[PDB]
Design an enzyme around this catalytic site. Structure first.
Site, PDB file in Angstrom:
ATOM      1  N   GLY A 118      -1.136  -4.096   2.120  1.00 53.97           N
ATOM      2  CA  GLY A 118      -1.489  -2.813   2.706  1.00 53.97           C
ATOM      3  C   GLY A 118      -2.498  -2.123   1.791  1.00 53.97           C
ATOM      4  O   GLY A 118      -3.323  -2.789   1.167  1.00 53.97           O
ATOM      5  N   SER A 167      -1.737  -9.912  -1.381  1.00 55.88           N
ATOM      6  CA  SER A 167      -2.828  -8.943  -1.281  1.00 55.88           C
ATOM      7  C   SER A 167      -2.543  -7.760  -2.203  1.00 55.88           C
ATOM      8  O   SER A 167      -2.546  -7.926  -3.426  1.00 55.88           O
ATOM      9  CB  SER A 167      -3.021  -8.521   0.179  1.00 55.88           C
ATOM     10  N   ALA A 168      -2.278  -6.578  -1.639  1.00 54.15           N
ATOM     11  CA  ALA A 168      -1.934  -5.421  -2.457  1.00 54.15           C
ATOM     12  C   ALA A 168      -0.800  -5.734  -3.423  1.00 54.15           C
ATOM     13  O   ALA A 168      -0.799  -5.258  -4.560  1.00 54.15           O
ATOM     14  CB  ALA A 168      -1.546  -4.243  -1.561  1.00 54.15           C
ATOM     15  N   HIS A 171      -8.693 -11.598  -1.920  1.00 48.11           N
ATOM     16  CA  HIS A 171      -9.669 -11.685  -0.825  1.00 48.11           C
ATOM     17  C   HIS A 171     -11.070 -11.948  -1.365  1.00 48.11           C
ATOM     18  O   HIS A 171     -12.067 -11.462  -0.821  1.00 48.11           O
ATOM     19  CB  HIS A 171      -9.670 -10.406   0.034  1.00 48.11           C
ATOM     20  N   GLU A 215      -9.185 -15.847  -0.318  1.00 48.88           N
ATOM     21  CA  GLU A 215      -8.174 -15.994   0.721  1.00 48.88           C
ATOM     22  C   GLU A 215      -7.788 -17.467   0.856  1.00 48.88           C
ATOM     23  O   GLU A 215      -8.619 -18.373   0.712  1.00 48.88           O
ATOM     24  CB  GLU A 215      -8.682 -15.432   2.058  1.00 48.88           C
TER      25      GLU A 215
END
Lengths: 230, 235
Positions: free
Chosen positions: A89, A121-122, A158, A193
């Site tokens: 997020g 991710s986050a 990413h 990714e």
């Protein structure tokens, strides 16, 4: 001595959400089942929805997921957790909420004392010493960029150096190189990714099929591939 | 539906059009907005990979043919007196977080805002456009330093997202620009976010904030589909 699974992203193209993470989680659980989910990076969906989604995808692995925002005593929930799962997020909201609720230090200590940490991710950003290599927009002030400091290097998830045709704005490497001016001691891992870093049994192992890039001050970017041990 | 804006602002999305020189497209905009002004103070603090002397000299060189005399705020004897006497405040692109951090640490943020409110022309591009907004919450830059607060100059009432594009690399699954903006609108639902593409600008003059440039601008508000705007639109 820490057990980390740090995923660049949640979803490979054409695959289900976290589908590629399931065999890596399965191999690292080592009997653990009790997980607390940290939903705070989620902005556009409710934390209850985010938690149920996480519980659903991990249920075939035997993992029981509790959302930290719904327990009466989040410190005790973290203290008893075998697994700490930090969803993707917005990284700034994730860090802000974690700090405001006094969860940042208990999470780090619980992982240092043996719990498995899974973040994508986050959640991979949060495991680093700071969130200074996030790609997210500063939509809220987290009152400090220091994070969990569970992984010693800065991960840029990413990672890609591609830009739209004719774009004159900063490239990803240019942004990272600016960080290396202000913090010349840092190593920045451009984690594309599809890739991950799995820290287990004393080794930090690079995984995933795409090329990973290492940036250090004054050095040309170094290409790494799956199997590299940090 | 903005009320009368009393500041003179030139807010460029970016410095350089494809096939053009640095700030080439800005020169006629600056020249026509100077309105007799010649004395400029340059705020170089966004620059990371170039020295602030180099940045200032580059800016002084490109604006000298317009009759603008540029001094860099980091090398004047008295930065507060220089801002007070400046006719023009010019804020260059670079890292928005470092720009805001240095401006706040040096106590220049409020004097810069106050000098512009009291009549000075403000020119900013990219990071300098971010800085003109109430906060830097719509920058695209990486948080390489902590600016101790995201509040900025508050000279322009809406949030600018410079370098706006919703395009993504092939197969990319990370957040789109509009998605990042939509998250801001969840946490701050009162905001208007202007997706200002490269090549475009916002010029505040004679009480009006007017969109400029040949590309489509997109405006985002909470719960509303993105709105396409073109040059000449008055905010």
């Amino acid at each position: 001595g820490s057990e980390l699974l740090l995923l660049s992203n949640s979803t490979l193209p054409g695959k289900a959400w976290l589908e590629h993470a399931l065999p890596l989680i399965a191999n690292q659980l080592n009997g653990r089942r009790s997980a607390v989910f940290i939903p705070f990076a989620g902005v556009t969906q409710t934390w209850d929805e985010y938690t149920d989604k996480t519980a659903e995808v991990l249920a075939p692995l035997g993992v029981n997921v509790t959302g930290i925002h719904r327990v009466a005593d989040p410190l005790a929930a973290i203290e008893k957790a075998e697994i700490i799962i930090v969803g993707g997020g917005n990284t700034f909201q994730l860090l802000k909420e974690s700090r405001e609720r006094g969860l940042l230090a208990p999470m780090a200590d619980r992982v240092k004392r043996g719990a498995l940490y899974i973040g994508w991710s986050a959640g991979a950003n949060l495991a680093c010493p700071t969130i200074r290599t996030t790609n997210d927009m500063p939509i809220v002030d987290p009152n400090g960029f220091d994070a969990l400091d569970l992984f010693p290097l800065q991960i840029n998830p990413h990672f890609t150096n591609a830009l739209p045709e004719g774009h004159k704005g900063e490239t990803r490497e240019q942004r990272i190189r600016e960080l290396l001016v202000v913090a010349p001691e840092l190593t920045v891992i451009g984690l594309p990714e599809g890739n991950w870093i799995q820290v287990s049994n004393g080794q930090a192992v690079l995984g995933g099929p795409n090329t990973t890039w290492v940036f250090k001050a004054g050095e040309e970017a170094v290409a790494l591939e799956a199997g590299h041990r940090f």
